[PDB]
Paper text:
Mitochondrial fission is a critical cellular event to maintain organelle function. This multistep process is initiated by the enhanced recruitment and oligomerization of dynamin-related protein 1 (Drp1) at the surface of mitochondria. As a member of the dynamin superfamily of proteins (DSPs), controlled Drp1 self-assembly into large helical polymers stimulates its GTPase activity to promote membrane constriction. All DSPs have two common domains, a GTPase or G domain, where GTP binding and hydrolysis occurs, and the stalk, comprised of the middle domain and GTPase effector domain (GED), which together drive self-assembly. Dynamin-related protein 1 (Drp1), the master regulator of mitochondrial fission, has a unique intervening sequence adjacent to the stalk called the variable domain (VD), composed of 136 intrinsically disordered residues that confer lipid sensing.
Here we present a cryo-EM structure of a full-length Drp1 dimer in an auto-inhibited state. Using cryo-EM, the structure of a full-length dimer of WT human Drp1 was resolved to a reported resolution of 5.97 Å and a 3DFSC resolution of 6.07 Å, which prevents the identification of side chains but secondary structure can be observed in regions of the map. Conformation 1 generated the highest quality map with the most particles, the best fit, and is used as the model dimer after applying a low pass filter of 6 Å to remove over-fitting artifacts. Overall, the architecture of the model dimer presents a compact organization of the GTPase and stalk domains, resulting in a ~ 100 Å decrease in length of the solution dimer when compared to the length of the crystal structure dimer with the VD deletion and GPRP401-404AAAA mutation. Specifically, hinge 1, comprised of two disordered loops that connect the BSE to the distal end of the stalk, adopts a conformation that places the GTPase domain near its own stalk. Comparing the autoinhibited dimer structure to the published crystal structure, the G domain of the cryo-EM structure is positioned 79 Å closer to the distal end of the stalk. The residues that form the discrete dimer interface identified by the Daumke group remain at the core of this dimer conformation;9 however, the density reveals additional burial of surface area between adjacent stalks in this region. In the solution (i.e., “closed”) state, L2S is juxtaposed to α1Ns, and this interaction requires a conformation with an obtuse angle between adjacent stalks (ranging from 103 to 145°) to form a more continuous interface. Helices α1CS and α1NS and loops L1NS and L2S would prevent the dimeric cryoEM structure from forming either interface without undergoing conformational rearrangements.
Numbering used by the authors:
A (entry chain A), B (entry chain B): 1 to 498, 640 to 736
The structure:
């Protein structure tokens, strides 16, 4: 069936209403470049002009366009949702509350107003997306995500290094293996020089998810026809290439007729391209995009279902936590503190059901630092320190003095090995902070995934984070001093009593004693850190939380709920209902589609 | 060889000064009983009256009678050893110089006066022997040890424990395996009743080294007969029994000619002893004693030669130490401090040439403590002993919570292994104390063998010993704290990162971790102890010595000297000369006796 796309659209609008996350469900992301009239193509598909276009960047903020296939039957069921104004091809904004704008001039004016208000004179990066639900009968069910396009020469007033930021934003958006890359390039510049195809190949060298679009098919008269480009024989695309005659900004701003432009484009394609005319059309292009999106949804159905189940479980836990009455504050807060301490201890030991060997965090990261980081850093130093025998001879001569060399002075050895042992001090401290910082990464990590009950009340989460940070800061100097004392004992007092022959003996003693000291440090420092820092704090975390979260009335402050938090709770309950409905709908589909 | 006899006597006048007999040597020790006529027999043997008369107790201090036959050959062994003596017949004391006693009565009076002065009014026994050498043409070369006689009158100013003191003094001499016990036995009663026989059976029931001389024969003329005791039918001996008549004190005090007494004794022996008349006598007793001594010297030739050479070398080294006293206070003190520091460092290295006669070469012993003693002590403390079913059950139930336990919680295992490891603190302190005692023994070795010149100045010796001991004792607590910290660190770390069933699992894990911790502590703690104690002392010995000993107002007090030290040095020089002479005399024998 084709209800999967409407279900995804419902999920997306719910996510936007509840602060949509970066992890988005399968959607078509459009990437353009210089002289790319993406907005013109979207208007041609819609059949009316409703967005501002421009060479390269059309809107300097992310734009979410939901083309809803609202047939004549559903016109009265969708126009009546808000206000009383109704039409056949109409757009709704959720960033701007209600106020349906049937007239496209109002939509353009609102877009310009918001762009000026937010982006300002210099157009930077705005992670907040812009949502616009378009309803029309001609348009098929589709979800388009428009972002600034990669351009060698930035258009308008923007940072000269904005190209890297745009590329990183596109990579972040298409990181999930569910986005359909709609590549739009100007016929004036070869696709090889275009950056959109470069990024598409970087994320996917094969054209398994990239649809190349050739625009500006009006200037080919002054040059060469794009027939070869559409065929795509230099860099074949496994999905195909569709080209249309893009409309200039001047004509669009003059309130032109979209039907005339579509007719001219169709005639041009039919004449210049005897074969690339059946599928190179607005309706055909929209249907091809919808089919590609459906294919991607079919491919990602297992991962999509896994993500949906994870989100449903998270929201169920959030609802269960939020519904607990504040009655009996002491017992509930004590239970929450005990649960948080148990989760933290399990994460330290790795027994918590949120971290595995695949993911580096908590105990796993500490073990990696102790074994690989610290061990490899210590091993990086050569046993002799890389000093040539000439240096050893010079040191021996300097220490012994101007007398014949017949007895080996051990002090010379002490002068050299120490220098190497001192170099072992720096990595240890570097590791200690890496461990300390790692503890900090735990504090939020659980709250990010495990202890959402902390996120329920921001005050409680902040207080717990501050208490844990203070405990870590108090324990850091003690562990650091103990490690430094161990290093000092192993460094200052080494001794051997605990010309060529003298140099050889000194070098051998240096190597042997340095290896022994390195082994001792490797065996001791991690164990000392576990003693003073990890093991000591494991059980003490619960006691510290209990003693710091309750003096006489601190419980009320911790469990404070904000109005924004209440709104988020309501939106999350709505999201939970939507997730339950989506899971019920998906359960109808057989497992044949989950492969 | 005659020269072999006097030299041994010189040894008896040197080692006995420092205490007991350092080396067993062929010698004659006279042991008497109550109412013993030893004085008369000795006077008859000497040919003149030179000892106190009377029976029972006649001398209160160890008196040595060293008769030397006059001969030009022996002169080299007499004048060279002493400051110089030459006369016809005379007695000389090694404790006195520049005075020759040509009259034996004067010798006896001087001996009595010295004994009274040293021992005071008391008749007890003092720890100070007497040296006496008698030269005459009618005395065979023989050395005897005339110990204080037995007294049966404990009452009076003399100590009530005189018998015990006399027994201990006699034992100190006869305990040597090379000594020959001349037992003076009273013929009035059975030989066993005599104290000499009683003491003889304590360690030498065979009597292989016991030569019996029967006294108190004057009163045996009427009544009981002494023939039974003379024949040895009471306590037979393997060497023979000699009968000498006890001369009356009154007759001797009246200036009785010794020749007349000898004639009377010979007549009495002929009349009363037909079996043994010319075969028994004081001269025959002296000849038998000399024969036994010479035969024992012949038997001990190899070992005696080796020991004499070793002692000669050692005393030459001591004289070299005693050779040149301090000439410049500051320079001599600095040289002594530097030499002491070097010797201490060498001893710590376990390679110093100077070594004791009872232990290892100082620092080497310390290594042994770290190898076998400490390891065996640690292994003696088995992991089992502190675990029982009741305590294990209680710990498991407490760790699990308010519900029964059917698993193996890690907290209980960690607590139990920590408690077991805490038991390892005591062996560490034992090893540290052993190392400290070894260092004290090294200090004593340096004081007594390597720094005899330091001994000459007792103040400096005491100051150095006290300073070193105080430094070691002050470094001791720091090492103890470091080892305790190491033990505490080694027990908290968890190495697993890289009801009967539960109890058995807990016990096995505890045993494994305890063994691992024992290995780790045995590998580590010795290094820390050497760093804090061995290396630190090696580095700071000179600094501490300079800081504590070097002063501008202690040179005179530290370097005090006394004439007694000069006398002891002269005695040591005489000892060295006598040892060299004995070595030269003994080096004239063939080599077949060595194998």
């Amino acid at each position: 069936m084709e209800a999967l796309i409407p279900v995804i659209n419902k999920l997306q609008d719910v996510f936007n209403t509840v602060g949509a996350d970066i992890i988005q469900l399968p959607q078509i992301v459009v990437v353009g470049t210089q002289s790319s009239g993406k907005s013109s193509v979207l208007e041609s598909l819609v059949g009316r002009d409703l967005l501002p276009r421009g060479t390269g960047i059309v809107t300097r903020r992310p734009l979410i366009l939901q083309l809803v296939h609202v047939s004549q039957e559903d016109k009265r069921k969708t126009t009546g949702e808000e206000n009383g104004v109704e039409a056949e091809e109409w757009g709704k904004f959720l960033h701007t509350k209600n106020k349906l704008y049937t007239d496209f001039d109002e939509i353009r004016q609102e877009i310009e107003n918001e762009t000026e208000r937010i982006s300002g004179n210099n157009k930077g990066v705005s992670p907040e997306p812009i949502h616009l639900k378009i309803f029309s009968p001609n348009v098929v069910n589709l979800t388009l995500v428009d972002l600034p396009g990669m351009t060698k020469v930035p258009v308008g007033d923007q940072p000269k290094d904005i190209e890297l930021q745009i590329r990183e934003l596109i990579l972040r958006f298409i990181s999930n293996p569910n986005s359909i890359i709609l590549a739009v390039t100007a016929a004036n510049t070869d696709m090889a020089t275009s950056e959109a195809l470069k990024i598409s190949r970087e994320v996917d060298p094969d054209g398994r998810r990239t649809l190349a679009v050739i625009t500006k098919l009006d200037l080919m008269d002054a040059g060469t026809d794009a027939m070869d480009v559409l065929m795509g024989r230099v860099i074949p695309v496994k999905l195909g290439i569709i080209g249309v005659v893009n409309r200039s900004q001047l004509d669009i701003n003059n309130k032109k007729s979209v039907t005339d432009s579509i007719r001219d484009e169709y005639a041009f394609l039919q004449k210049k391209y005897p074969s690339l005319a059946n599928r190179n059309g607005t309706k055909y292009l929209a249907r091809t995009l919808n089919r590609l999106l459906m294919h991607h949804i079919r491919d990602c159905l297992p991962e999509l279902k896994t993500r949906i189940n994870v989100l449903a479980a998270q929201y169920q836990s959030l609802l269960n936590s939020y519904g607990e009455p504040v009655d009996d504050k002491s017992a509930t807060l004590l239970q929450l503190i005990t649960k948080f301490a148990t989760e933290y201890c399990n994460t330290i030991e790795g027994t918590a059901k949120y971290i595995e060997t695949s993911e580096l965090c908590g105990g796993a990261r500490i073990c990696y630092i102790f074994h690989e980081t610290f061990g490899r850093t210590l091993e990086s130093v050569d046993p002799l320190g890389g000093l040539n025998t000439i240096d050893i001879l010079t040191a021996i001569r300097n220490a012994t003095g101007p007398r014949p060399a017949l007895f080996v002075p051990e002090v010379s050895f002490e002068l050299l090995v120490k220098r190497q042992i001192k170099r072992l001090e720096e990595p240890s401290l570097r590791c200690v902070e890496l461990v300390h910082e790692e503890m900090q990464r735990i504090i939020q990590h659980c709250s990010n995934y495990s202890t959402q009950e902390l996120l329920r009340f921001p005050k409680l989460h902040d207080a717990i984070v501050e208490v844990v940070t203070c405990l870590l800061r108090k324990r850091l100097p003690v562990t650091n001093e103990m490690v430094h004392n161990l290093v000092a004992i192993e460094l200052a007092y080494i001794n051997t009593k605990h010309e060529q022959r003298d140099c050889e003996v000194i070098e051998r003693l240096i190597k042997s004693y340095f290896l022994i000291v390195r082994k001792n440090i490797q065996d001791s420092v991690p164990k000392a850190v576990m003693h003073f820092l990890v093991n000591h704090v494991k059980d003490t975390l619960q006691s510290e939380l209990v003693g710091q979260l309750y003096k006489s009335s601190l419980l009320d402050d911790l469990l404070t709920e904000s109005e924004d938090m209440a709104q988020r709770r309501k939106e999350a309950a709505d999201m939970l209902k939507a997730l339950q409905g989506a899971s019920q709908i998906i359960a109808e589909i057989r497992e044949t589609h989950l492969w």
